[PDB]
Write an enzyme that holds these catalytic residues in place. Structure first.
Site, mmCIF file in Angstrom:
data_model
loop_
_atom_site.group_PDB
_atom_site.id
_atom_site.type_symbol
_atom_site.label_atom_id
_atom_site.label_comp_id
_atom_site.label_asym_id
_atom_site.label_seq_id
_atom_site.Cartn_x
_atom_site.Cartn_y
_atom_site.Cartn_z
ATOM 1 C CG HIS F 200 77.964 -52.799 -31.165
ATOM 2 N ND1 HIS F 200 77.800 -52.356 -32.460
ATOM 3 C CD2 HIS F 200 78.285 -54.111 -31.254
ATOM 4 C CE1 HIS F 200 78.029 -53.353 -33.297
ATOM 5 N NE2 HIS F 200 78.325 -54.429 -32.590
ATOM 6 C CB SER F 204 85.210 -54.727 -24.062
ATOM 7 O OG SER F 204 83.905 -55.249 -24.180
ATOM 8 C CE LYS F 226 87.289 -66.196 -18.970
ATOM 9 N NZ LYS F 226 88.116 -64.971 -19.084
ATOM 10 C CG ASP F 227 80.251 -64.683 -21.185
ATOM 11 O OD1 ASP F 227 81.319 -64.540 -20.561
ATOM 12 O OD2 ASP F 227 79.763 -63.773 -21.880
ATOM 13 C CD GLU F 270 66.057 -58.903 2.644
ATOM 14 O OE1 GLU F 270 66.615 -59.631 1.802
ATOM 15 O OE2 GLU F 270 65.410 -59.360 3.607
#
Ligand SMILES: CCCCCCCCCCCCCCCCCC(=O)OC[C@H](COP(=O)([O-])OCC(O)COP(=O)([O-])OC[C@@H](COC(=O)CCCCCCCCCCCCCCCCC)OC(=O)CCCCCCCCCCCCCCCCC)OC(=O)CCCCCCCCCCCCCCCCC
Ligand SMILES: CCCCCCCCCCCCCCCCCC(=O)OC[C@H](COP(=O)([O-])OCC(O)COP(=O)([O-])OC[C@@H](COC(=O)CCCCCCCCCCCCCCCCC)OC(=O)CCCCCCCCCCCCCCCCC)OC(=O)CCCCCCCCCCCCCCCCC
Ligand SMILES: CCCCCCCCCCCCCCCCCC(=O)OC[C@H](COP(=O)([O-])OCC(O)COP(=O)([O-])OC[C@@H](COC(=O)CCCCCCCCCCCCCCCCC)OC(=O)CCCCCCCCCCCCCCCCC)OC(=O)CCCCCCCCCCCCCCCCC
Ligand SMILES: CCCCCCCC/C=C\CCCCCCCC(=O)OC[C@H](COP(=O)(O)OCCN)OC(=O)CCCCCCC/C=C\CCCCCCCC
Ligand SMILES: CCCCCCCC/C=C\CCCCCCCC(=O)OC[C@H](COP(=O)(O)OCCN)OC(=O)CCCCCCC/C=C\CCCCCCCC
Ligand code: HEM
Ligand code: HEM
Ligand SMILES: COC(=O)N(OC)c1ccccc1COc1ccn(-c2ccc(Cl)cc2)n1
Lengths: 49, 445, 79, 106, 62, 378
Positions: F200, F204, F226-227, F270
């Site tokens: 923050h 971004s 969009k998320d 795995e």
């Protein structure tokens, strides 16, 4: 290119700070064995048995 | 041609003494003007609570008329030859001096001897000098720097004579009689406590015979002649806060206890204060300056000014700093200043000490430029060291200071010590005394 | 201190916009979209694909040499 | 600094300029630099007409990438027309940082 | 004005606060094995002849 | 007087999700950060159910898990939501790290370093959840960790005995593995709030690598819708793997119970640990193999120091894009080798691919950025 250690004035960088640390590389051999329940320095002295 | 050779060719000071104990000193320098004066061991630290405004009252009446030259006749004689009269009073010294032409030397010494011996303290000039002094006290309240240094002495020396002010309280000014001023002169204006100094176009043999003609009737030893007792004064870590939000800027002074006059620690403590330095907002250097506190305060606009001081008395002193800033900047200025004191107790480098020695050499020779500061240096060094220390001796003491000496002396005086604090104005963001006292030691070293 | 009126300095730039209710949400979809996603595929195919080809050749050589080291023995199986 | 490969190594430079594709978004080379502290001081020292040109070219390229589109080929930035407008201001900012660093150790 | 014995080792170890950072470790002894003088000699004195290791010689080597 | 700008709790939400300035050219690769927050919440409201009906002992562990698929109501759906939900977390984590490696997001130094701590904590958690069902893969996979954990030259033999409950395989082994698995997902939830508080401060990064302060948009409604769409596409893939092939990601030999009965036909974990098991298995020394295991994840911290390009991301660097996809193809090779037996072709391949993983990051990537610097005349 970490040549900030390489200088002709800050050679006294390490000469005002290491007289603190005359024991500070061996305080794990003085202080941690107070709680390890080992016998690291417990044979050194007849102080403790 | 060399700075070392130029310190050898400085003319020396010649000292003599009369039968009553008066010392006479001179430096001849081949110029048509001169400065001659009288320096006295008197001041407010020799007064008690009953007569604290006595020495400052006497300095006002010194140019108002003597027995031979009454009233304004002294002032007409000084002006008609083109000469100047001046005076001052500190907590330990008092001076009167004349700047005149070097061929007016016999008249100048004669007027000075009549001022200190035969001054009339007439009862009509008193009761009209009270109102001048009472109005001067109200003018002193508007000077924030003078108020905050009076606060610093009053809290560092709380129950001693060294906490009093020079001017004295207003109730003492209203009640000082004529009898209290005549007792002050008889007890303090005495010939082994006086120095007659001169600098300029003077011969020492001429000043000595003028001193025997005008000063020989001074009382040498006194009625019962008891030794003037010297009570020392102790330092107390404490603080005083005066909160007034209507003032636009805030003044803060802080100091630890320092050495006396004859202590040899004074020279490396002045190399150390020259590394911290001084700053003002009208400087052109700004963000490029060598001092770390000066470069930070110019980049972030933290203060209006700061300065470091070295005040010395006979046995003790004050060693610290003073700064002016706005109400939102007190906590940051105190954080950076205390971090520079701790960075000299540890970590002080050889390249800082070379710069700080060059500053002190330049400040010593820049003071002694002209007949008046040379004559004042003669008159107060004979009351302080008993001798004049020449410039070649100051240079050999400065040359033996290095980085390990500065670390030893700064650790002795600063590290883990209680300071004295004074604050005036909008000081709500001045930190608590516990947070200030914790700033005098580190976590690591 | 990163809010919308305090970000950066800008001069002489004009923008024009339409309301979402005034336009159709699906413009040219196969007229523009199919030629667009094909030159995007052409622009990145020589960077991404040749590493994954070399994984394929090592995988086939590694599973085929595993079997004829084990129990596949035509002719080295004599006295 | 080889005179025999004077034209050959300029062919590899022109090839790499087209393989990288900031010229398809209408960008110059100094638009694409990573902004550390020395670069951010050089942007503050630009004249007002070169600053405003850089701000619009970056905004137009961010808008093209949002739409996954490029410019027409006649509007691409040419190789021998790319102006290194930031390089004289950046060489001076770095020389001043290296002067303050030799002083701090000598 | 001779002082008292409160200048303990203040000029020797305690000024530079090197001691203070590591008293959990370095300055940590004298208070486990030196306190055999403490609780165990007191607790067995209030309970003499009542714990098991008091009534012990009666029931081995029989 | 706007209540979402002045209320003490509402203004924290408004600065974080609603009025936050965001770049306008953010791609679908920036969706996987909120997908990791959905997968972590889902693994908490499903691990609630399993630890309720659970007993962890050497005599009843294998049957405590088979009780849930048959007898416990809605237990077959919740168990395989949990086993496939952890495979979903690990595919959303490898996309997320490879994004920040490709676009130079590691230059956000404090955000990147908390991320490397988050990658260690979920890897150690999932290791202590596969040991809980107690089958053949649970036993022989745990007992190759302690061979390299007792190889610590001083403290290692009392370290493994302190975490095995006290001796060896016993009742209380699965009381310290189960304790180290219930509580580690909640340190991850607190390390994720600190992870976003550092992001923050700058906002971004974007695919061009250029700062975007002249072209910001609000987060609502453009990236909130969009998320939500990207999370709906993740629930479709997860419920397809649960309701149509719930054993596709798994091993049948972990349905054979745990006992030191017999050596298994193979040993493999795995799929999201197969790259790490392939590296330590190609080192014939139980101290050199435990050092290169920790050096395969903590090598990410050297990525800010090894950067020599004048640009931030890889969008305009064609020679560096080739090396990034060689590294992805090298991790596919190690995932395949780590499920193969230790035989002739899978030792020379599995140990050359262990070398090339370190040669690309340390040597080949810093030299290639310098070569691209010279070709652009800086
Ligand atoms: C969110 C939705 C996912 C949520 C569900 C979770 C599922 C997780 C998952 O399984 O992986 C999905 C995830 C899907 O990725 P994505 O985020 O949807 O795609 C990102 C966009 O391409 C991002 O767009 P892009 O810009 O990065 O496109 C990439 C590239 C490549 O361009 C293309 O190739 C075309 C892109 C459109 C594809 C349409 C294909 C039509 C047929 O485009 C370009 O070249 C343009 C870059 C600039 C060049 C200049 C050209 C100007 C324009 O991973 C995969 O890649 C597939 C793996 C699926 C199985 C996982 C197991 C792996 C084995
Ligand atoms: C550590 C993290 C802990 C969080 C974990 C979950 C714990 C949940 C929690 O912390 O509860 C906090 C709890 C509610 O937290 P929340 O519902 O999750 O969201 C915080 C909202 O900002 C709280 O909304 P508000 O209290 O600021 O609302 C102010 C007021 C003003 O609202 C209005 O009149 C309409 C104005 C438009 C509101 C648009 C909001 C923007 C979206 O609302 C009303 O008059 C009626 C409420 C409308 C229905 C509520 C549903 C809407 C949400 O906050 C309080 O307890 C407020 C203190 C109440 C004391 C009242 C004293 C005066 C009487
Ligand atoms: C270039 C390569 C990266 C350069 C490293 C510096 C920037 C990264 C950083 O600061 O992360 C610190 C942190 C490591 O730094 P550190 O040892 O904690 O402090 C020494 C540094 O000078 C960092 O000291 P500092 O300047 O950051 O001093 C403030 C320090 C102190 O402030 C606090 O941490 C407050 C303590 C929290 C109290 C609440 C506890 C709740 C329980 O704040 C932090 O370190 C917090 C950042 C890490 C969050 C962990 C806190 C847990 C939440 O990064 C990590 O979390 C692990 C990465 C370690 C390798 C990176 C450096 C080697 C290359
Ligand atoms: C309560 C614990 C009491 C311990 C004594 C104080 C511990 C610090 C000693 C200070 C040594 C000198 C540090 C340098 C001077 C300085 O200004 O540092 C700035 C800075 C500000 O504090 P001081 O100004 O020193 O105030 C001390 C007033 N007596 O010094 C610091 O120590 C950093 C602040 C951390 C202090 C931690 C607070 C006490 C911790 C235990 C209480 C737990 C709750 C408090 C919150 C801490 C985190 C949970
Ligand atoms: C390990 C086990 C396996 C992990 C999962 C592996 C996932 C398979 C990855 C295959 C996905 C292929 C994506 C196809 C899209 C594509 O490549 O198009 C190229 C396209 C071009 O776009 P720009 O670079 O912006 O423009 C440049 C113009 N020259 O490139 C991109 O999309 C950028 C790639 C973003 C990275 C997203 C994650 C990629 C997955 C790689 C996994 C690597 C994991 C590394 C982490 C290791 C942790 C220990
Ligand atoms: C539980 C694990 C994690 C969670 C919940 C999480 C969450 C998030 C979120 C919500 C974002 C912002 C949106 C986005 O860009 O996707 C983000 C960004 C970021 N994360 Fe994570 N993350 C996790 C793990 C990691 C790891 C393992 C790394 C790296 C080693 C990492 C490094 C980063 C970086 C560098 C960014 C900023 C990227 C950019 O803006 O370009 N995170 N994370
Ligand atoms: C980051 C979050 C988590 C991850 C990656 C994770 C991973 C795993 C894995 C791999 C298994 C093995 C399933 C199998 O092999 O069949 C499992 C099961 C289990 N988990 Fe988690 N888990 C997480 C969260 C939790 C939580 C929050 C709890 C407890 C509240 C928990 C407790 C358990 C238990 C008791 C089991 C055994 C039940 C079973 O095997 O079906 N886990 N988990
Ligand atoms: C789901 O669990 C398994 O796959 N497990 O463990 C029961 C298993 C099963 C059989 C064989 C091997 C393993 C484990 O193989 C590895 C290889 C590397 N790690 C690892 C673990 C933690 C950390 Cl921090 C870092 C690396 N684990």
């Amino acid at each position: 290119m970490l040549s900030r250690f390489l200088g002709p004035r800050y050679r006294e960088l390490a000469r005002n700070w290491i007289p603190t640390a005359s024991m500070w590389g061996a305080v794990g051999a003085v202080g941690l064995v107070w709680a390890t329940d080992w016998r690291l320095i417990l044979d050194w002295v007849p102080y403790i048995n | 041609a060399t700075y070392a050779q130029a310190l050898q060719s400085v003319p020396e000071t010649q000292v003599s003494q009369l039968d009553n104990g008066l010392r006479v000193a001179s430096e001849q320098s081949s110029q048509p003007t001169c400065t001659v004066g009288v320096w006295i061991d008197a001041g407010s630290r020799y007064e008690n609570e009953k007569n604290n405004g006595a020495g400052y009252f006497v300095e006002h009446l010194a140019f108002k008329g003597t027995k031979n030259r009454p009233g304004s006749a002294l002032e007409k004689e000084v002006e008609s030859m083109g000469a100047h009269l001046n005076a001052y009073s500190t907590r330990e010294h008092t001076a009167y001096y004349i700047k005149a032409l070097s061929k007016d030397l016999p008249k100048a010494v004669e007027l000075l001897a009549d001022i200190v011996q035969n001054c009339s303290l007439e009862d009509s000039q008193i009761e009209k000098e009270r109102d001048v002094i009472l109005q001067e006290l109200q003018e002193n309240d508007s000077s924030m720097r003078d108020v905050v240094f009076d606060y610093l002495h009053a809290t560092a020396f709380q129950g001693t004579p060294l906490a009093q002010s020079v001017e004295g309280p207003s109730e003492n000014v209203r009640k000082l009689s004529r009898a209290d001023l005549t007792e002050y002169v008889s007890q303090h204006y005495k010939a082994p406590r006086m120095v007659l100094a001169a600098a300029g176009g003077v011969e020492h043999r001429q000043l000595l015979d003028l001193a025997q003609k005008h000063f020989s009737s001074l009382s040498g030893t006194y009625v019962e002649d008891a030794v003037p007792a010297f009570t020392p004064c102790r330092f107390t870590g404490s603080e005083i806060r005066h909160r007034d939000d209507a003032l636009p800027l805030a003044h803060v002074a802080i100091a630890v206890e320092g050495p006396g006059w004859a202590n040899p620690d004074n020279v490396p403590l002045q190399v150390a204060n020259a590394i911290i330095g001084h700053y003002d907002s009208t400087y052109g250097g700004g963000t490029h300056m060598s001092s770390t506190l000066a470069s930070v305060a110019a980049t972030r606009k933290l203060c209006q000014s700061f300065q470091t001081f070295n005040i010395c008395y006979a046995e003790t002193g004050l060693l610290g700093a003073h700064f002016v800033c706005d109400n939102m900047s007190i906590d940051d200025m105190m954080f950076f200043l205390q971090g520079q004191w701790m960075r000299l107790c540890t970590s002080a480098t050889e390249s800082e000490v070379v710069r700080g020695k060059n500053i002190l050499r330049n400040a010593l020779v820049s003071h002694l430029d002209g007949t008046t500061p040379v004559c004042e240096d003669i008159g107060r060094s004979l009351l302080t060291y008993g001798r004049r220390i020449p410039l070649a001796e100051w240079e050999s003491r400065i040359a033996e200071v290095d980085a390990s000496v500065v670390r030893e002396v700064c650790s002795k005086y600063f590290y883990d010590q209680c300071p004295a604090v004074a604050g005036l104005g909008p000081i709500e963001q001045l930190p608590d005394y516990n947070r200030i006292r914790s700033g005098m030691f580190w976590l690591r070293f | 201190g990163r809010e919308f009126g305090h970000l950066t300095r800008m001069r002489h730039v004009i923008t024009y916009s339409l309301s979402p209710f005034e336009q159709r949400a699906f413009p040219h979809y196969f007229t523009k979209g199919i030629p667009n996603v094909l030159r995007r595929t052409r622009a990145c195919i020589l960077r991404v694909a040749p590493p994954f080809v070399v994984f394929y050749l090592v995988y086939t050589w590694g599973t085929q040499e595993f079997e004829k080291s084990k129990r596949k023995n035509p002719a080295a199986y004599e006295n | 600094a080889v005179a025999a490969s004077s034209k050959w190594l300029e062919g590899i430079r022109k090839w790499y300029y087209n393989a990288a594709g900031f010229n398809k978004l209408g960008l110059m080379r100094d638009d694409t630099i990573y902004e550390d502290d020395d670069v951010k001081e050089a942007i503050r020292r630009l004249p007002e007409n070169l600053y405003n040109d850089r701000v619009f070219r970056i905004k137009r390229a961010l808008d093209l990438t949002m739409r996954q589109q490029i410019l027409p080929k006649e509007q691409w930035t040419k190789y021998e027309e790319d102006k290194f407008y930031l390089e004289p201001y950046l060489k001076e900012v770095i020389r001043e940082r290296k002067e303050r660093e030799e002083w701090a150790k000598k | 004005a001779a002082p008292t014995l409160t200048a303990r080792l203040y000029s020797l170890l305690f000024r530079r606060t090197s001691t203070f950072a590591l008293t959990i470790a370095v300055g940590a002894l004298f208070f486990e094995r030196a306190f055999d003088q403490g609780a165990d000699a007191i607790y067995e004195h209030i309970n003499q002849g009542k714990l098991w290791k008091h009534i012990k010689h009666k029931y081995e080597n029989k | 007087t706007n209540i979402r700008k002045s209320h003490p709790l509402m203004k924290i939400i408004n600065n974080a999700f609603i009025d936050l300035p965001a770049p306008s050219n953010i791609s679908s690769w920036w969706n996987f950060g909120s997908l990791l927050g959905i997968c972590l919440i889902l693994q908490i409201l499903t691990g609630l159910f399993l630890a309720m009906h659970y007993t962890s002992d050497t005599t009843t562990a294998f049957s405590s898990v088979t009780h849930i698929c048959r007898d416990v109501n809605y237990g077959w759906v919740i168990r395989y939501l949990h086993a496939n939900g952890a495979s979903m977390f690990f595919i959303c984590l490898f996309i997320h790290v490879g994004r920040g490696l490709y676009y130079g997001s590691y230059m956000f130094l404090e955000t990147w370093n908390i991320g490397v701590v988050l990658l260690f904590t979920v890897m150690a958690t999932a290791f202590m959840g596969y040991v809980l069902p107690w089958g053949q893969m649970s036993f022989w996979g745990a007992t190759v960790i302690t061979n390299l954990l007792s190889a610590i030259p001083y403290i290692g033999t009392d370290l493994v005995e302190w975490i095995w409950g006290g001796f060896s395989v016993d009742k209380a082994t699965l009381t310290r593995f189960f304790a180290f698995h219930f509580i580690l997902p909640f340190i991850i939830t607190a390390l994720a709030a600190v992870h976003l508080l550092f992001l923050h401060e700058t906002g971004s990064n974007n695919p061009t690598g250029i700062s975007s302060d002249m072209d910001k948009i609000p987060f609502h409604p453009y990236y909130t819708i969009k998320d939500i769409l990207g999370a709906l596409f993740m629930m479709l893939i997860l419920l397809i793997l649960v309701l149509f092939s719930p054993d596709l990601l798994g091993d049948p030999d972990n349905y054979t119970p745990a006992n030191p009965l017999n050596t298994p036909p193979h040993i493999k974990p795995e799929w999201y640990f197969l790259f790490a098991y392939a590296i330590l298995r190609s080192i014939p020394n139980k101290l050199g193999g435990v050092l290169a295991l920790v050096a395969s994840i903590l090598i990410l911290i050297l990525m800010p120091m090894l950067h020599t390009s004048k640009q931030r991301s890889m969008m305009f660097r064609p020679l560096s894009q080739c090396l990034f996809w060689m590294l992805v193809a090298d991790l596919i090779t190690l995932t395949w080798i780590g499920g193969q037996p230790v035989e002739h072709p899978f030792i020379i391949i599995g140990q050359l691919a262990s070398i090339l993983y370190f040669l690309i990051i340390l040597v080949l990537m810093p030299i290639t950025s310098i070569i691209e610097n010279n070709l652009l005349k800086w």
